[PDB]
Amino acid sequence: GEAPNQALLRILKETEFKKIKVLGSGAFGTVYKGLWIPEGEKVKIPVAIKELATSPKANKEILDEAYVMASVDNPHVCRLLGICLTSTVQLIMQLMPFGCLLDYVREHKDNIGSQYLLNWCVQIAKGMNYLEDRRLVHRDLAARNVLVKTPQHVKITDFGRAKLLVPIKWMALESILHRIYTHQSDVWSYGVTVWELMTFGSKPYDGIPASEISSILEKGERLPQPPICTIDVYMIMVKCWMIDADSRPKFRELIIEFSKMARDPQRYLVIQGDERMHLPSPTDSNFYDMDDVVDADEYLIP
Numbered sequence: 001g002e003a004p005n006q007a008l009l010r011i012l013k014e015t016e017f018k019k020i021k022v023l024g025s026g027a028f029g030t031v032y033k034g035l036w037i038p039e040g041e042k043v044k045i046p047v048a049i050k051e052l053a054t055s056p057k058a059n060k061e062i063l064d065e066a067y068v069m070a071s072v073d074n075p076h077v078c079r080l081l082g083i084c085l086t087s088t089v090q091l092i093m094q095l096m097p098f099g100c101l102l103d104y105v106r107e108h109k110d111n112i113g114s115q116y117l118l119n120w121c122v123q124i125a126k127g128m129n130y131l132e133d134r135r136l137v138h139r140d141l142a143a144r145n146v147l148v149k150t151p152q153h154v155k156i157t158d159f160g161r162a163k164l165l166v167p168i169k170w171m172a173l174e175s176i177l178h179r180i181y182t183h184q185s186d187v188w189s190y191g192v193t194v195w196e197l198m199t200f201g202s203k204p205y206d207g208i209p210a211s212e213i214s215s216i217l218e219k220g221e222r223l224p225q226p227p228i229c230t231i232d233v234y235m236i237m238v239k240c241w242m243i244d245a246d247s248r249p250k251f252r253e254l255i256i257e258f259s260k261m262a263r264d265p266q267r268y269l270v271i272q273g274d275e276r277m278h279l280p281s282p283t284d285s286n287f288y289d290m291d292d293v294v295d296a297d298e299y300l301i302p
């Protein structure tokens with residue numbers, strides 16, 4: 001019926017990698033910064049180590065996440081490097097040194113221009129289109145779940161809820177009412193993600209309890225038009241929030257729409273001091289022991 005999943009699950013020795021410091025902690029668990037020094041391979045790979053107490057239910061959930069994360073392979077999606085089998089199972093992933101996109105847009109607002117915002121939209125749509133090709137429904141797309149490798153390269157992560165074909169404020173109305181999840185319900189969440197970027201990290205429907213959201217959507221209320229957004233960009237966000245799921249754009253169409261806009265960004269987003277803004281590039285001073293350091297994107301198979 002469905003094709004065999006021949007993805008390799010790499011088991012990494014505790015001795016092969018080190019924790020440096022905690023990068024973040026919360027409901028999602030705890031994520032540490034680290035260095036992976038494999039075999040006699042003469043490489044140092046910057047890594048992120050995730051662990052969501054030693055309980056069998058936690059280990060079951062993180063292995064479900066590992067299953068999905070080891071099965072993906074796209075430049076705009078985060079792949080699992082391996083797992084470490086300690087009392088609590090750890091996920092070994094690529095270090096995304098600029099953290100999540102949500103915090104990034106709040107912290108770097110004054111230096112984020114139309115080109116960056118539109119390019120991020122294309123990249124998120126590319127990653128989501130890839131997950132659709134792989135018949136995977138994310139079920140938790142949000143700006144918090146998009147990580148920043150460099151300011152010009154973002155990837156989708158957090159496969160903890162991903163399934164083959166509760167964040168109410170990012171959910172499609174069918175998802176809230178009937179628990180119906182599809183690629184088109186992911187498109188709704190994509191629209192909310194775009195709204196989060198265009199508002200430089202605003203909280204969707206702020207102050208409104210999650211219990212009131214379904215009723216607000218049924219009345220026909222939607223997230224407001226962000227100040228920087230032209231009707232062209234807002235109309236796209238609005239189509240992602242249509243009641244009829246089949247009336248919403250497809251990720252392949254969102255790639256096209258945002259790409260055309262990305263060719264003339266100042267026509268589609270109005271930002272004071274645009275094009276005069278600067279963000280860190282891998283061609284800048286002190287962007288990167290240093291010797292033998294290889295990014296995970298350049299470290300292919302053992």
Ligand SMILES: CC(C)n1cc(C(=O)NC2CCOCC2)c2cnc(Nc3ccnc(-c4cnn(S(=O)(=O)C5CC5)c4)n3)cc21
Pocket residue numbers: 023024025028029031048050078079093094095096097098099100144145147157158159
């Ligand atoms: C706490 C997290 C968001 N974090 C903060 C980082 C970091 O470097 N932060 C610094 C940024 C610059 O300022 C100082 C902190 C950082 C760097 N690299 C990764 N690496 C990956 C790669 C692939 N997947 C994941 C992953 C999967 N699930 N989750 S999660 O459960 O945490 C999800 C809800 C968000 C993360 N992490 C995660 C990182």
